[PDB]
Design a protein around this ligand. Structure first.
Ligand SMILES: O=C(O)/C=C/C(=O)O
Ligand SMILES: O=C(O)/C=C/C(=O)O
Ligand SMILES: O=C(O)/C=C/C(=O)O
Ligand SMILES: O=C(O)/C=C/C(=O)O
Ligand SMILES: [Ca+2]
Ligand SMILES: [Ca+2]
Ligand SMILES: [Ca+2]
Lengths: 462, 460, 460, 460
């Protein structure tokens, strides 16, 4: 069963029970590309914004209070998620998001009609607005909320898990590795202090993008001039959004033309997510290499077992959380390339890559948030160190000859490391055998300099 | 509400009506990352492959016919999308696809149990297999099927629509543009013949990757050695798959270690899709620039109206199909970067980025297929040329002085073009008014050489 | 002619006159890959750092004043560029930059020898150091200097040129374009204020990355533990670098392990350069589209003529500066992908992609700096507006019906716009012809609403 | 000292001794961006093409033999490398390469003038040509030559070195690793057979792009219509280029508009180079991990020592060739992103990103060629295997319980692997201790199944 709806292009047959109308139905037929529509977070931001716009139009005496109350009530239902099934339009729609904007207007008009209030989707629900300021506004609201309320707390949780290991393993000595080769001693805690700093720097990177990510185009309307909107429409709508979201990062854009002709704030934010993906790849790769083997690998640490590793090789348990992290990082890198591509190709008064840029940035925020919490809770928290094996590794490195450089010189330390590795003998034995004990180096000096934990120079903790 | 299942790690509470068992349930709790599981096409390939493996194990007398028949029947139901709700594992799972492989084994065991047959998910359903050869095999089957049966016909449809316009507009003269500036004449048909060749070359690029995209790891098992499988398991399974799908491009990998340690065939195929995204961006951008305005743009052609353009500016109609094409192309570029990143980071006997690489390559195939057909049907087929305006544009270009180079020289031809633009005069009148008619250039020569359609040199 | 030099691996034949020694010569034979060595800016940072390290070793009484004075004098010669021909090692060397570190140590030892001072390249010139902290320190010094002293002033110059045009063309009305289609009026000044803000935001993005770009690994030595260096070596060297360069952004890293195991500050900085490339592409594309034609394009503005446009089409002048800008932006995007790839692939205590990451980030800084100044001086400064053509474009847009929405409604405004375009009539006459003048709209109100400059709502 | 030269824009002061003239000098002032001009290979292809064009113009009686002979002689000097110092224009010039085309025309006219032959750079040296067909033609000649004559032989050399190790180490048993964890046995030779296949597939990928990489735009002139050129100019010039280079891969483009409006063949070729970078990353990473330690790593193989590893840690030797390979791969990925970005942004009759695309594709060919030969000669050829350590690693893997699956079942095999790892006992003794010897498994069958070399199933 179908019903007739109309727009300025003509009559359109719409499924009888759908709350959307003519323009949403045309967009359903024009863009069957990915088979996926807007996400819960996107629909929420659109509903929140539509309600705020109706409230301001009402306050300024431009829209009758009964009509504004119907929009506010319908928009609140949309924001809470009661009508996500009424947003069937593909992500790969017209680049301004006109179709999803009209989707919100039409669904509100249908909800209001069930309450006995007649609203025109353009004249009433879209009063003082354009898709060109509302769709990037709803995108930037969703991106700002994803950064502040979800990603930053998830990264803080991962940072705290890494920092707790850095403290726990502060004096657990092991051999450092540079170029994958035997280096001088480090502690496991020192390496984890490095990982924790990468995540802390990741939080700093997200926070540094917020002054421009939180800029909203609302009030600029069609081309940024604010035509058909009151001069204070933008600041009044943002006032409501800040009060209702608690997001102090939300503000009217510094320049109304830049805020619509470009989506540079999304490209900037993706760069921060991409740097986090780069940091997470290093952390996850080191952790699975430390857990490698056990018998054929490094066997430095034990990762918590999360599931049987293999359908054919029995007993084997795999580093599945570092694998999910490195695959998420690859996705964030890909999404980042798509966002920049869209960002660069605006023309004149409008960048028409917004639905695609919105899909990718919001997905990158989601993946990084979810995988960071799982990595912290299901992997980092439960790691255990193989203390004895790590100590043996530290002591086996021929590079432990290095602190003798000031006493015997680099060339003689290299002759010591050579005469030892070839004869499968210790650095200590070789130093004595080459008659190096004397004025330049006593026996007490040698054993003090060769102590692997002292060689790691771990900071003294109170 | 829940039932107990177990694996070698212990007991797991599973939803009472779920057809999956212990290992799928662990994966549900370990990877809640994207909130999306395998696509219909991926589940089909896994079901298809599981059935083919049971058939070969049965043919070789390794699996009792009653057990093999139960796997074949259950796997066919999975392949035919009767149990997609029984595959809840995230894309961002363990990099070998072990979890989705065990998901298929467990769901087949549960289906077989309803038919009165007891199957062990490892010993029976996974006999002669590993996730390490089965999951990349199912990925390469799905990718090969997407290329041959869906993308190539969609690109052929777009090519034919572009070639139809090249023929219809063969003598529709217009001004060429280089660097966005006034150039010599072209026909609108010649431009469309360029677009048609880009799509034809795109088909050639997809076809050229098929010998390596169609390579399957099946038979290599855990590390590529084929341990716990018959020596001819791979060749026998590939023969069953080819007959069951009609997909002749499927083949056993040339090297069983390369086929599991790497996913280079996916990286190669993504490069072809990325080149198609690059070609489509040029075609879609030119088409929306040709349709620009009408009054403030180039207004060369009219795109079919597909929907009201704007919620605030009434009457305005936008080039929505070229916008869908250029956004899809951006996504394919991004997906391509993710595929290469995963492809480079294999280690020793296994590349563990397969679920992520599979997601991206299959999505790129889907988006390009669907948008190419929509672009051909809802945009290219219905384009109309503004023949009058195009003619005025061709004749207005000062670069139409170019065929006079052999008669008056480049330097004098430049002086003519500058003066004609400055005095808002024709090239013809500027040539005469500069006193250039004489022994080197007769008036008949001038009139002959300035004909814009003849200047486009359209093939007879 | 050659001479014999030695290292712990053995004898090496070195060109007789070369100031480098055995380890540089081995690196010349091991890495003939790109055929390009370190840039002037990289050799300066290495020379500056080596001198600062010798000064601190001297201040702490670890190095004899005669030896320290010889290193300081030789390092100052390297810093000034007298010896760039003594750095022949390829960019694509060992990933820590060990070879270029030993190149600096060996060349300083050879220069000091000419002055009668014997220095061991390891024991003296490299005292308290590693390549693992010095090579990323010299990279981060060069990158910080490129950002603060060169790119930010170049972007400020471009911003000021764009802002000057935004002011000069504040009331130069034209038609806005959305989706490349006829939109409501804007001023050329308003568009240029948008471009100005993109560059201003670009400066903010570079400034926001400086707290982490300026972090130096110096003092961490081999693995970040500071082994074989005094405990205050890093803080003393940084203070000397700050006093000598005036770059207050140079600071000791917050974590000595993160500062060597990763190059995340370079990845972060590249992201800011990549965003600037994205902004510059939009600005340059709009400018060449505004200058397009003239007769077959938009012909909105005139770009200064910089060179003859075409070897075959006489008279034609091309937008060469916007083309230089968009090609630089493409390079910065590519360099950005190479930097991130290297950045992700560190292992344990060291990221061994530093020479490649250094090449790409420093090149992106250089290209953006040089093309931004050329774009501001040779293109933006000299632009002229075609004021009458721009006014006719604003008045011709059917979307000028938009401010009537509140009086006649969106649906009627769409019927007005469509009828106006069909009958090739003005919006004003179509409103009167449809009998819309009455209680909801007076002729006085209509004429006020249709004024294109008033419609652009330019700020007072 | 300077001299005056002129073009259609006016008079230009040119350095007295420079062989270039007015347009090259304007380009020197307009584009000081990267500070690097065209490469030796690019200037060679431009010289070769200019000579071939003069020969064809002479053959068709369009150019006086004295003038054609002077161009052919001068173009041969340019192609030979005698005048690379006469090409000062930056890579980041006008996107068509107009400046470098005029650079070639002007330098040829100056060389010819020394023998008393007057040639007009446009009317004579550029007869029947445009920069729009010659600059992409010279780019595609250089790219085709780099692929056929340099990269493919370098990859063949690497393939042969990898295949030689696959043969030598055919029965050198080791433990396989999947997910970096203990897997079933493989041989070192089997892994090298996987590496050899990745390079062999890389050669196949380069060969598959040659039908489109070798397509030349020559003859299409300004916009692809062939205006001001003979109808067979393209086919005649290509015939000369094939005879002089011996490159049968050089062909006239299938469509003259596609060949100039787009550079899709460069994007396609870069995708093959990018796949090779992906393959090389896996191979180089496995090799440095196998050579890791020795005492704190895997210590599976020994890489040849090429230089002292470290300025601070004495004795240490690093895997510098795998590091140069992985950094080259990162650069090829970055260059690939820049090529695709330029490729997608053509407009109408011309893609104006050619100098940037040319720089990146030719650099990717060069880096891959040079690093592949160095990797084969200085690393792969000299590798040695630690045979006894490798066999002990194979025997130590608990996953050697895997071939018992058919006898005791997966669940019981897991119980064996658990007990053995927990009690530090062998798989063999755990099987006996669990009382599994009986009807399903004899002691003789157990010992045959646990033989690690037999478990690797190396081909006879
Ligand atoms: O949908 C709108 O509000 C705007 C559309 C346009 O600029 O075309
Ligand atoms: O699930 C499998 O078949 C393989 C797993 C592994 O290699 O760990
Ligand atoms: O330099 C040429 O041959 C062409 C130039 C143009 O198309 O502008
Ligand atoms: O050259 C150095 O100082 C360090 C080298 C290494 O870690 O191998
Ligand atoms: Ca707050
Ligand atoms: Ca039964
Ligand atoms: Ca041949």
């Amino acid at each position: 069963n179908y019903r007739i709806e109309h727009d300025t292009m003509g009559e359109v047959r719409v499924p009888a029970k759908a709350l959307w109308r003519a323009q949403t139905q045309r967009a359903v037929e024009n863009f069957p590309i990915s088979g996926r529509g807007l996400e819960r977070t996107q629909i929420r931001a659109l509903g929140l914004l539509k309600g705020a716009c109706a409230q301001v139009n009402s306050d300024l005496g431009l829209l009758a209070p009964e009509k504004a109350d119907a929009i506010i009530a319908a928009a609140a239902e949309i924001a809470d998620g009661q009508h996500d099934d009424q947003f069937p339009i593909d992500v790969f729609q017209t680049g301004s998001g006109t179709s999803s904007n009209m989707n919100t207007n039409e669904v509100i008009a249908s909800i209001a009609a069930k309450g006995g209030v007649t609203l025109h989707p353009n004249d009433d629900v879209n009063m003082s607005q354009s898709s060109n300021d509302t769709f990037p506004t709803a995108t930037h609201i969703a991106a700002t909320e994803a950064a502040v309320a979800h990603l930053i707390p998830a990264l803080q949780q991962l940072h705290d898990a890494l920092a707790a290991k850095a403290l726990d393993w502060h004096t657990v000595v092991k051999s450092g590795r540079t170029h994958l080769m035997d280096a001088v001693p480090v502690t496991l805690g020192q390496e984890f202090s490095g990982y924790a700093r990468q995540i802390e720097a990741g939080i700093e990177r997200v926070r540094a993008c917020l002054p421009r990510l939180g800029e909203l185009a609302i009030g600029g309307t069609a081309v940024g001039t604010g035509l058909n909107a009151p001069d204070d429409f933008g600041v009044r709508v943002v006032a409501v959004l800040v009060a209702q979201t608690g997001l102090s990062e939300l503000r009217t854009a510094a320049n109304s033309f830049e805020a619509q002709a470009a989506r540079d704030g999304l490209v900037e934010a993706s760069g921060a997510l991409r740097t986090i993906a780069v940091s997470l790849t290093k952390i996850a790769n080191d952790i699975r290499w430390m857990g490698s083997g056990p018998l054929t690998g490094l066997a430095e640490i034990q990762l918590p077992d999360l599931q049987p590793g293999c359908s054919i090789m029995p007993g084997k348990v795999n580093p599945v959380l570092p694998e999910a992290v490195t695959q998420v990082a690859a996705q964030v890198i890909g999404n980042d390339a798509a966002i920049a591509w869209g960002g660069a190709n605006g023309a004149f008064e409008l960048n028409v890559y917004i639905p695609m840029m919105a899909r990718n940035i919001l997905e990158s925020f989601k993946l990084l948030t979810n995988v960071s919490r799982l990595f912290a809770q299901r992997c980092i928290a439960g790691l255990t160190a193989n203390v004895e094996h790590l100590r043996r590794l530290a002591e086996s490195s021929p590079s432990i000859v290095t602190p003798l450089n000031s006493a015997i010189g680099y060339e003689e330390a290299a002759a010591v490391a050579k005469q030892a590795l070839k004869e499968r003998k210790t650095i200590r034995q070789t130093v004595i055998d080459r008659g190096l004990i004397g004025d330049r180096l006593s026996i007490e000096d040698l054993d003090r300099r060769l102590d692997v934990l002292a060689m790691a120079k771990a900071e003294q903790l109170d």
